[PDB]
Design a protein around this ligand. Structure first.
Ligand code: HEC
Ligand code: HEC
Lengths: 125, 125
């Protein structure tokens, strides 16, 4: 869907910005600093689930740029592993949010965050 | 969810960028220049539906900036009308995509585009 590589960069950066907002806005809730409304978090995680599937299609062949390391493309299987692991952890977060269980939400949220950090370390400049 | 007004600006700009990609990538399909796969478009419109609900919460009080005209805030009822009309047209696009009807998709897509343009004219610098 991208006329030039730059367009893919702009898309993924926006997707990741949104993803990050929908994840990080739950921090005060998982820490207990903000109240836990199970329905609010369920709805928010549903949005996060949608967003978290979006960035990966915008790292297609030839879309090198932004802060993406070139190893995303030359190690495609390893990058794909990190993104599928992250998405699998999003599935676990969805299950916790759907269950309305603050303890499971906290644990699942920590797993997601670690998946973000792991891909960041390997694949972001 | 925004620590500073700038954060809201960055969020809405990213949401609108994504929204725009998910809408505009269907242009060649509605024009017949790309093939029409009803399931592909149904799935894409589902993503667009999610995205199209997101920007409005990031124009909260005191989040003036970006290319947002200040009239968004001083004419809140009029801005809200444009966004709800746009979202209602997204509902019509969803129905067309769910029905797998290229004719209805084309018409619904044109209505959505006109809603984008109308808000742009009134509320974007
Ligand atoms: C690889 C499988 C990743 C996972 C999982 C996550 N992110 Fe990431 N992120 C990744 C890359 C390669 C990049 C750079 C993209 C580019 O072309 O510049 C990023 C970038 C971000 C950004 C900045 C986006 C911007 O506005 O420029 C943010 C804020 C970000 N990533 C956040 C983030 C979070 C919160 C994640 C889990 C919820 C997450 N990322 C996962 C690669 C990967
Ligand atoms: C009001 C109810 C709007 C509707 C409906 C749409 N858009 Fe819009 N858009 C609006 C504003 C006020 C702004 C400026 C936001 C800011 O703070 O700068 C925008 C901006 C865009 C952008 C640019 C985003 C960026 O990266 O800076 C795009 C690409 C855009 N809008 C596209 C677009 C499309 C395709 C719409 C319908 C599918 C659409 N907008 C609707 C206000 C409104």
């Amino acid at each position: 869907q991208f006329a030039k590589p730059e367009d893919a960069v702009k898309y993924r950066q926006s997707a990741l910005t949104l993803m990050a907002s929908h994840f990080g806005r739950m921090t005060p809730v998982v820490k207990g600093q903000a109240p836990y409304d199970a329905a609010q978090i369920k709805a928010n995680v549903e949005v996060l689930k949608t967003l978290s599937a979006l960035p990966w299609a915008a790292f297609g062949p030839g879309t090198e740029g932004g802060d993406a390391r070139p190893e995303i493309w030359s190690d495609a299987a390893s990058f794909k592993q990190k993104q599928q692991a992250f998405q699998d952890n999003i599935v676990k977060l969805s299950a916790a949010a759907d269950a309305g269980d603050l303890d499971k939400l906290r644990a699942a949220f920590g797993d997601v965050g670690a998946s973000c950090k792991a891909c960041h370390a390997a694949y972001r400049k």
